Design a protein around this ligand. Structure first.
Ligand code: ZN
Ligand code: ZN
Ligand code: ZN
Ligand code: ZN
Ligand code: ZN
Ligand code: ZN
Lengths: 256, 256
């Protein structure tokens, strides 16, 4: 995988957060490693008084315990907000069936509204916790979690996020935890993507950053071309998630 | 001002819609001219059985009346969803003060969630109703109504939308009604932007499309260079609304 000079990378992230969130920030803390890493970097960069964490569970599971652990060890201000009543109200108003992915989308978008409502009230910005691995594969809710003012680790692959998390003191059981967006019980990132993040990042790195042909990738890693075509598919089918709403142009229709 | 070939613009928009939303569409109808125009274009392009209109009032005013009329004339399926209970619940969880714009943003984002919940359930796409005038001045809610799968008129200035609204047969009182985002009683676009759309568009077109200096612009018009800077102001401060969440880059830190 590409090699980064973490010492310098971490430094640049901290400087970036200092420059963008001097007036304080609001972050969604879920108990996963991405939001915890952003929570740690933001705290070290601005100091705990400038970091408000919102823990917004839908399910009452151990994930909440992990998030509070992050909040606790950092000493930041935080708030636990049960979003199930609001989420279910969206569903009751829908009056139609909705699969688990659609329901997960409501949860994530509901968290987005909560984050922005708090940031707006406090004159703060919202720090998103998405990473490049999710960004390139479309593994995120459009307009939901992820949607923020600034995203400190959007340009870092998952593998790198884990390395940085360990280096900054993020709880080990969190760093080692199996990745899960937590939209429904039993949801597992690698099972949904059908590949580990380690193997994914190796492909994205070569396919997007290096622009290395599908064939060179498969062999230059001893992996089935299928696995490579798969990844390339996730990227193509999620291109609509990496751009603002588009419409028709009318340049050749201008008159004079 | 720019001169467009309306008959052809409409034709292109209809083709765009027939291409992007063959499986049906969900549109937020608010009783304003933009959403009305998109509703008319979508209906004429796909047939009324492929257009679902969600009317989502927070206030109980005339606004809801115009929304229903648009839905009635088109014969499309429609659903009236009172969003106040959900919006007020967000506020209750907030437990902090929120000015009218912040509250207006909760409304807009709540409608976005409703729109995608129906779209997701019915396997349809969401058509945004923002226009270029709003887009360039940042006069919309981030992740709110400014969030959809496709925005058919986003590249048309407000003045051009009005013209198109008349040609496709949008109700006259709506086409003539004074522009308002309706996020708070008494709200007026022109009154809030400190300029009429007609003048605004003249400037935008010249300042952004033609890339003409504000100096000559103030000249070719007859308006104080201060009003011309006021627009340049609105544009620069809304740059954060015309892009996806960004984070720091690390190209120079990659050890290759
Ligand atoms: Zn490697
Ligand atoms: Zn109903
Ligand atoms: Zn994540
Ligand atoms: Zn793994
Ligand atoms: Zn509009
Ligand atoms: Zn006017």
């Amino acid at each position: 995988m590409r090699i980064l000079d973490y010492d310098k990378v971490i430094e640049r992230i901290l400087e970036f957060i200092r420059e963008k969130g001097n007036n304080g920030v609001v972050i969604g803390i879920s108990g996963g490693v991405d939001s915890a890493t952003v929570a740690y970097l933001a705290t070290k960069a601005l100091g705990k008084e400038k970091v408000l964490g919102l823990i917004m569970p839908y399910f009452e599971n151990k994930d909440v315990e992990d998030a509070k652990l992050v909040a606790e060890k950092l000493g930041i201000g935080y708030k636990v907000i049960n979003i199930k009543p609001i989420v279910d109200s969206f569903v009751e108003n829908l009056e139609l069936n909705l699969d688990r992915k659609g329901l997960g989308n409501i949860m994530s978008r509901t968290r987005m509204i909560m984050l922005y409502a708090h940031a707006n009230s406090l004159g703060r910005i919202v720090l998103g916790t998405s990473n490049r691995s999710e960004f390139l594969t479309g593994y995120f809710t459009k307009w939901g979690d992820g949607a923020s003012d600034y995203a400190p680790i959007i340009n870092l692959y998952k593998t790198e996020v884990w390395e940085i998390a360990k280096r900054i003191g993020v709880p080990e059981r969190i760093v080692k935890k199996k990745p899960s967006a937590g939209l429904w019980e039993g949801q597992t990132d690698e099972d949904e993507l059908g590949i580990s993040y380690n193997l994914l990042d190796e492909i994205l790195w070569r396919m997007i950053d290096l622009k290395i042909g599908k064939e060179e990738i498969a062999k230059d890693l001893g992996i089935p071309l299928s696995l490579v075509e798969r990844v390339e598919e996730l990227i193509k089918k999620s291109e609509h998630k990496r751009r603002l709403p588009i419409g028709p142009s009318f340049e050749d229709l201008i008159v004079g």
